[PDB]
A paper describes a structure:
In doing so, we enabled the formation of iminium ion intermediates formed by the condensation of aldehydes with the amino moiety of the pAF catalytic residue, thus mimicking known reactivities of small molecule organocatalysts in a protein scaffold. Assessment of the Michaelis–Menten kinetic parameters of these evolved mutants revealed that the mutations that improved one catalytic activity caused a concomitant decrease in the other, i.e., directed evolution produced catalytic specialization. We successfully obtained crystals for both the RGN and RMH mutants, with one crystal diffracting to a maximum resolution of 2.45 Å for the former mutant and two crystals diffracting at 2.55 and 2.24 Å for the latter.
However, RMH has new side chains installed proximal to the pAF residue. In crystal 2, the side chain points to the back of the pocket in both monomers, whereas in one monomer in crystal 1, it comes near the pAF-amino moiety. We hypothesized that the R92 and H93 side chains introduced in the evolved RMH variant could assist with formation and dehydration of the hemiaminal intermediate by acting as a H-bond donor and proton-shuttle, respectively. We used DFT to locate transition states and intermediates for a reaction pathway where H93 acts as a general-acid residue to promote hemiaminal formation and dehydration. With the participation of both H93 and R92 (i.e., the front-facing conformer), the reaction proceeds preferentially via the (S)-configured hemiaminal, with the highest overall barrier for this reaction sequence being the hemiaminal formation 15.2 kcal/mol above the lowest energy substrate conformer, and the dehydration step proceeding with a barrier of 8.7 kcal/mol. Noncovalent interaction (NCI) analysis on the transition state structures was also conducted for both the forward- and backward-facing R92 conformations in the (S)-configured pathway to identify which NCIs may explain the role of R92 in lowering the transition-state energy.44 This analysis identified a hydrogen-bonding interaction between R92 and the hemiaminal-oxo moiety in the forward-facing conformation, which is not present in the backward-facing pathway. Our previous MD studies of the RMH-variant substrate-free resting state demonstrated that the motion of the two R92 side chains in each monomer is sensitive to mutations, with the cis-forward conformation (i.e., both R92 and R92’ facing toward the respective pAF15 residues) being greatly diminished in improved mutants.
Numbering used by the authors:
A (entry chain B): 4 to 70, 75 to 110
B (entry chain A): 4 to 70, 73 to 115
Write the structure that this text describes.
Amino acid sequence: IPKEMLRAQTNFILLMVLKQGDNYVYGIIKQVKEASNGEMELNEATLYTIFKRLEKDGIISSYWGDERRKYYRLTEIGHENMRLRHESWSRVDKIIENLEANK
Amino acid sequence: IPKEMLRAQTNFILLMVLKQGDNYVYGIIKQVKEASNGEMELNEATLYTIFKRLEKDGIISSYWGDEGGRRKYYRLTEIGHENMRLRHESWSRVDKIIENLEANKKSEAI
């Protein structure tokens, strides 16, 4: 499994979490650890690296709670990319099914 | 849509095509366009570039076939078939994680 694929899989998971709803880093690590039955356990510094890029590209934004803790939210643009990406990957599944069909 | 994602998708179809059976560049362009009902149009020069990478990594190899004429075909190696299995398994696990994220969510509601 190539390095590019584990990065892509990690990205997909984080963005799906925020689509479930706003959340914070320590909450994101816990939720993921228990949904993989302990298999996937993310590192603080890793999430920070990925969030800097996503916030630079306008995909997510952050704000304060109880104003102590820092929350993250999927932006307007962000929701749009989720839909584009899901659509393209759906069409590919049909194409492959059809390559074998005409076969 | 990121470049790496379209790059990954084209990679994915191409390897699936060879998994259907051996093929050559023009047939690969032909076979895909008719299964996409004309929608998808692959570039020759890209395929030339993309097939070099896969052969460098031991994923595909080629041999000579007779058309009449004489054509060059491409074939998926063992290493290729094993990566196909690995790739499918990992992405199955990712789908499970997503399945459980929404369940534990609905469980907190109650």
